[model samples]
Target: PANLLTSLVRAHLDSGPSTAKLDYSKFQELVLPHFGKEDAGDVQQFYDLLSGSLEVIRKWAEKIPGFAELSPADQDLLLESAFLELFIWRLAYRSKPGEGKLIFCSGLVLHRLQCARGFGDWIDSILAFSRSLHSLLVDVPAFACLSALVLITDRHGLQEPRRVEELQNRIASCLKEHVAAVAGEASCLSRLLGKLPELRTLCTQGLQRIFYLKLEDLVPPPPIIDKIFMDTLPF
Candidate 1:
């Protein structure tokens, strides 16, 4: 798991063109045939749940005025299912037995969506997608970030001596870049983005000290893979 983290996260950036490539038709053909009928069933259930939720959201978005013409509820239902079809297709794109690709891909998609072009009606779709994805994948970047935090707070996730300082520097650099790109501030993502520097520092320090941290480092979770780490640690 330790080594897998770096590899899985990095693979997301490398295995495809834009993240959209992660959603293309060909890869789905390559990966889907391998999944058991049971995985397919779970994937369908996730699609149905997200589809139903988005129909409700679309109904609300239309009523607010000046937004694009809201489709009829039936239309919204159809669109909702279509969008989630793309989503589930993406989820299955990298499926492999024991690879946990569905979970990882879901996390990647959630992270990418949260970084949407900008927050508006369109961006709300991204956020909703992200929230839905998070419901499925536990060890996502956000969860990992918090796990690193508990380590730093309790003083625990790094082998290198200067890890904390380096992480802080990297986080600050990335945050600055994001802020500059988004204009004065990125209000919708501010709460989450603002936490990165703290998390970077926390993880860096904790790993250096090798201390154990708790899940309380996070807000809450259906996705806290940290417990897997906790159970396996010799401490």
Candidate 2:
């Protein structure tokens, strides 16, 4: 029974690559053509790409044992609240270290100069954090465990608070057990747990950027990103 959480976490990781790797040749031919020489178009296309990638990540997340068992409404609540955070986790998890660059899914690399029109100040923080996490060298199982814990955290207006909290505790314990078993240094657990608060801060920054972009009205978001804004914003 104690191993149940580990079993679930590993099973989800086994489902597929947690982060989709970019194939440069295919991306150039099939995807890069959409940029169309306008900053606005680039931003819109970026959101479209992000929305599609999010759905894939969502499917992977819903495969975690207790996640699919939740009521649809509750599942939506968790997904909306947690998706952006999980997105950044996957981005950082898959990122390659670089000078003045951000690596995204499918090997889509954006330089810091090119990111300002869309990503703004948030890109700097995200890239910095990604670099730090990459240096930490977190393994896939632990990353999956961390993402699960992020998703199941207690939230205001959740339909089943106790159930979600129970799942959070289970994942936390599982993470501790994993760090003890796999890490040679005692500091690894603290180092990894320290990342959670930083991730939450990044999420706040992301929400602010989305809200600012919405107000600027430079580019309309795709339906999925729009709905996420509606659900994730503080009412």
Candidate 3:
């Protein structure tokens, strides 16, 4: 496998479409030279399979405008990414890892924003972000404190080079400066709490509230239609 695509495809296959958060801006340039002639055929085949599927649904998509002008290769890449993302979201939804409510809330947020923006396949975009959040959760375990702190900062793109190192420094400093030794001790309690069956029950209830209950109130997703409302709504 071309090393470049090896990583990206691995991420795509591993992560899921809703959260396909790879910074592939430099991928084509860095990796294209590495594509061997014999390997290129397989690469193109993968692209064809992925993009052909996307073309089937392009017209039905709400936000993806100007699809006609985009090159077939680009279409294939986009579709492949989307499919990978959707796959990840389905896994997380079924797995119900910690704070499922947060994930469910993300789904609601995406649905509501899509309804509001009415553009660019909003649900896909939102799920992508939620999945990105999942990546962050996995990468940074101190989300409760650190994400809370970083979220307060106003910087636009933390992933950018100038910002990435600085952001890491800032987060590290936040952990070091704000969190005291006693605060470090808090993890022990957190771990203990995690083991408590009562906490699990509570977490489950909270998750149910958001996913099974509150999600309905936030937005009426097309996939999940309320039968009573569907019967009454004129649309």
Candidate 4:
């Protein structure tokens, strides 16, 4: 193996995303709280947060080394498929589980108490996963590779899967090398890989939430979120 990706992981991690959070002039107005389930005001802010977070996902994905090689369509599919997974994955790393605090991708921090209202059952599922995730004390470089691998996967409609698969294998190898450096943490790869599947379940749970919210008709979906939602259907 060339070991080129391991260095790229750190390289991208060093110059992290900018403009990740919502740039609303009155963002404080968009803060999450205990809004009644399915209520209009409650639905609006959450979707705004969703739109903002998805933008953040794009910013970070652009920095991954092999990502540029995939065709534009493949890039869109991977990001759409992997969005919520990365959303929860990255959040788990910055979590303060004991404090019931969720530090979001955009640097917007809110208590899980306030957040679960927007997420419904999805919040509990992610928080439960976070407790174990935080316990691992994973090093930053290992995590960098993990996040990169999450997007470079073999999903149903990828145009260049072999290209995607090759990059995934390299990042996976780098993850193994990085994880081995920690003591008593030697066997953690299985658990970390397990998270990917579990995250999909949470992603489904999230889609249902968004679906129901759309039905409620509190606010319009952002075009980006709408496109992602529509294209995700099983044709």
lDDT of each residue in 105-207, candidate 3, tens digit only: 1122122221212211323443444454454333222322232222222232222334334434444444443334335525533332232232223223222
Show where candidate 1 strays beyond 4 Å: 1-12, 15-129, 132-157, 184-189, 194-235
Better of 3 and 4 by TM-score: 4
Residue 80, model 3: Cα distance from true site in angstroms: 35
At residue 168, give the lDDT of candidate 2: 81
Q: Whole-model Cα lDDT per candidate?
A: 0.32, 0.72, 0.30, 0.72
Q: State how far residue 138 of model 3 sits from its true place (Å).
A: 3.4
lDDT of 2 by residue, 62-96 (tens): 77777888778888888888878878877776655
Candidate 1: residue pairs that collide? 138-223, 151-156, 156-206, 156-207, 156-211, 158-207
lDDT of 1: 0.32
lDDT of 1 at 173: 43
Please list all clashing residue pairs in model 2, or write none if there are none.
22-106, 22-107
Give candidate 1's total backbone clashes. Answer: 6
TM-score of each predicted structure versus truth: 0.27, 0.82, 0.20, 0.83
Candidate 4 local lDDT, 1-235, one digit each (tens) = 3355556555545433334652333323244554356565556667766766776678677767778778999999999988877877877777678877777655566766655666777788888878878887767777777787778898999889899999899888777766665542335887667767776777787788878767867676778877777777676
- Provide the lowest-lDDT 10-residue window in model 2: 25-34
* Backbone Cα, N, C clashes tallied per candidate: 6, 2, 9, 0
lDDT of 4: 0.72
